[PDB]
Design a protein around this ligand. Sequence first.
Ligand SMILES: *C/C=C(C)/C=C/C=C(C)/C=C/C1=C(C)CCCC1(C)C
Ligand SMILES: *C/C=C(C)/C=C/C=C(C)/C=C/C1=C(C)CCCC1(C)C
Ligand SMILES: *C/C=C(C)/C=C/C=C(C)/C=C/C1=C(C)CCCC1(C)C
Lengths: 219, 219, 219
Amino acid sequence: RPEWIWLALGTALMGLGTLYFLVKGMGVSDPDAKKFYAITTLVPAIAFTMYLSMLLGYGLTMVPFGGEQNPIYWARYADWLFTTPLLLLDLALLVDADQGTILALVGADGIMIGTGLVGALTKVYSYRFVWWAISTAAMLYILYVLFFGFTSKAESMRPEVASTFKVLRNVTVVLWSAYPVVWLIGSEGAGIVPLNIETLLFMVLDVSAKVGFGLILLR
Amino acid sequence: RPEWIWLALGTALMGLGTLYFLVKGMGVSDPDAKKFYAITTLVPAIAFTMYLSMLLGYGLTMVPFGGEQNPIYWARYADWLFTTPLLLLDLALLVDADQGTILALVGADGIMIGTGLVGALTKVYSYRFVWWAISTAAMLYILYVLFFGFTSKAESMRPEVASTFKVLRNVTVVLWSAYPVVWLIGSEGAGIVPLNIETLLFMVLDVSAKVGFGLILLR
Amino acid sequence: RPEWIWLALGTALMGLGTLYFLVKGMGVSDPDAKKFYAITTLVPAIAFTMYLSMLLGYGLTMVPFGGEQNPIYWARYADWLFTTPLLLLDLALLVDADQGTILALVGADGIMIGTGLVGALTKVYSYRFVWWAISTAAMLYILYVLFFGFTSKAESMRPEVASTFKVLRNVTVVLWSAYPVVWLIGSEGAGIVPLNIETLLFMVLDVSAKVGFGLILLR
Ligand SMILES: *C/C=C(C)/C=C/C=C(C)/C=C/C1=C(C)CCCC1(C)C
Ligand SMILES: *C/C=C(C)/C=C/C=C(C)/C=C/C1=C(C)CCCC1(C)C
Ligand SMILES: *C/C=C(C)/C=C/C=C(C)/C=C/C1=C(C)CCCC1(C)C
């Protein structure tokens, strides 16, 4: 009930970029710029639908025993699994990396949100902190590859595509370090900050994580 | 009950192309012709399994309140999400387009059938006309890109791959304009033409949409 | 109950390769070797999570009528659909095949485990031997393409990438011929060898199928 404003405002903050970024897109100047744009207009568009999902009844599938109390949203992972892989596909093409590190990067995140989604889904004889750990170890892996493999290739004769990528790394690193700590303290972990606050918190991270990320890759 | 003949005949009309098109395929003459064939044999093959799904009990997940009355098929979107993206992958390679417009084209349809599937699934505090609209806006987008972006590239020194693509555009445009209007009048919208007729209608569009489409890309 | 040891040991036998193979990976010597490694570390990693899924309560969705007796695991197909396509992506890049035969190969397996998963899921007016057949016909197809299309390209001026691929074909062919016969005799077919034995059987095939497969592609 008290998450509605964060739900609808979340859709409103995404129902802006999909509108703004769609106008600049489709402008055939460079074939490479086309793929870069495409994605950073599809990303806030998939989450927009998803937030409108949480707004209009959707998102439910329980955590440790549902029906009795604990309310949860599955619609969230339904988009993080369909947002994180493409957002890295925009930062892997910038770094002009080989299909090798890109592949692991999809299978890495796939498992990261797969394992998290499962973690949230009921608690069938398993501890939900088990999966939270597997998904965290899955995330650190990316941070390793991000500030190690990408950096050892970040330059490309162009100071921009190398320093305007550093600002991306700052955005992303602080951004993603966030999600995990937001889990085991209320939403789907402990039970300190219930559902209400968790819903705003998660959305702040999201609007900044996509439109803000895209609001970098436009400059 | 009265959809069985349209179900089984639908499987019969697909259980023909998968058989015909499989014989001509695997003929290594051109590496490019190989990828073109592959898909237009996998498409009527995925729907064939799906139709046999609707025939043999599958397809259920409710619309506005199930269990009481309104019978629906989820197996349908389970294939449209797995047919439309590849069928455009055959018309995007013909146009020899960049990975840019191809990508948006997958994420565009993904959301088109994702949003439609959801629209059909129950009606949890949300209007099923909301998603029908989001999926329609998702479809017009493709029609824009199809008869704008593809045309402004349709030629390629080969009159065939440019005019035998125009006949594809006619097939596709009239074809897809169909689905949407078929929704809000009975099947999962209003309630004029119930389930019976809707089942034939949908299949006519399908046999023509795939085998007929493939029966173009063979000539 | 009696499958626990096979479940946990299965996770233990995969919770070894993901550890071993991760140490050798990320070693940038060749851009081509990078993609080859990536996958054969992600494969036993996805199944590892899945086995830990079967271990910790997950895997349930019934076969012919559930809730009354027949216990099943859906977590299995949840990984075979996410293991078989990538494992062939490692043997299709070795053979340096065109995007044509690779594509059919993904859509072929997709339907193979899709059709099998469905086969296992309840038995809604349909015979579970119907899908078992569709999934078998889907598998023979690959064996045709594997020991026909790949062989008629296996050489590449390098005796290794052509003979150390033959040993892969032996591993794979005997390996995959296995799964199908393991189905209609107990697990989800007849009812001779119940759940207990089926759980070991399936795991023997798995540890050998991935780590052992990977333990080839490392040499
Ligand atoms: C737009 C949304 C994006 C980019 C979401 C990204 C999400 C993450 C970095 C999530 C990470 C998680 C964990 C490390 C463990 C617990 C589960 C998650 C999903 C919160
Ligand atoms: C073989 C099946 C194919 C190519 C199916 C294509 C489907 C569409 C063009 C569907 C469009 C829809 C809408 C615009 C809104 C309502 C939901 C759909 C799925 C009927
Ligand atoms: C690591 C797991 C792998 C590589 C699994 C491969 C699985 C198969 C070859 C499965 C085949 C099946 C059939 C032919 C019919 C019945 C259903 C299956 C899934 C057992």
